[PDB]
């Protein structure tokens, strides 16, 4: 019950990062060349957008199952499980029918030409055809988290992403499939994950949720119970996916296809920099919310200001590590002769892009404080305002109205994130003083 409650609760006891599919797909494909590395990079926003809707649908399922198991309603929990699986079928089918005829015009809309589009279409149509496998893994994970089997669902996700790291160089180079082999390795890895999930959902004994069609009564209330929790969650990741789509377009006008290869490589490396501070963000919500339940604003401010000071020191080490060891980190994407043309530009991006990570704790821990005091809507507004308005806005300005070129893209993302981190932190200071004045 002090400042030690932040360190004693921010342990990060395992996490869920499905982007390691994209990071492993990027490292193993970059050996073929920048045209291939840019091809998978053009589809990462779409792959991330499908994850957003799917993982959001599973989040709403976990909430509806947990409160129905806690309310001692067995058939209600079984009914929610059947409803979410039908929604995953409708969602998986809709994405396949919609995105297949529109994926060509989507890549070509953002100025992507050359062979990078043809390689992206090959890589996209395979993953889009297996979109049901992707949505089932997220909704199936949601059902396991709702009934308490969150540990077993965590192993299936780690097994899939880890198996894709091994299966990537086999399908791409050994079997000679090339860029489309990375899509096969992702599809094959998630089917193995789907088999584990389906085992604990249908075959394993002594599960509190029995997915049987005898309890399926189509209730319109269950539909909005899943969407009430899922849609706000998916809207956060969906905002990031849309931003990466337009940031890929800005990178094309700034440096062509090699600009996307450099961007999609440094962006995946920079997104790993916020991983050490993720545990402090989830811990800040738990501590500030506990202090808000006690209505102790003094402990509330001390908790979330201490999380910023610790996360700032951690991010200083992350920024210093990436700037110092940039040519070693960039070797993960430039380990072949064909990839040497982007070696110099990738090292320059790794010493300019991760600069905004030092101000991220000021904005991320404030949004975590908002979610603890029941004002999670403000946390969703800040992320949409950061990724869409500020990231894409400044990057667009530094490219069309300055001569910085590729470096204009990185400076825009840094300034765009810092400006959003300041106004978000200032919004928290405004809200903290509003709660302090709530004394009479």
UniProtKB/TrEMBL annotation:
Keywords, comma-separated and alphabetical: Cell membrane, Membrane, Transmembrane, Transmembrane helix, Transport
GO cellular component: plasma membrane
Repeat as UniProt keyword: no
Membrane topology per record: Multi-pass membrane protein
GO MF term set: antiporter activity; xenobiotic transmembrane transporter activity
Membrane found in the keyword field: yes
Location(s) in or outside the cell: Cell membrane
Transmembrane intervals: 4-24, 36-59, 80-103, 123-144, 156-176, 182-202, 267-292, 304-326, 346-368, 380-402, 408-427
Source domain of life: Archaea
InterPro entries, sorted: MATE_fam (IPR002528), MdtK-like (IPR048279), Membrane_Transporter-Flippase (IPR052031)
NCBIfam families: matE
Protein name per UniProt: MATE family efflux transporter
Taxonomic source organism: Pyrococcus furiosus (strain ATCC 43587 / DSM 3638 / JCM 8422 / Vc1)
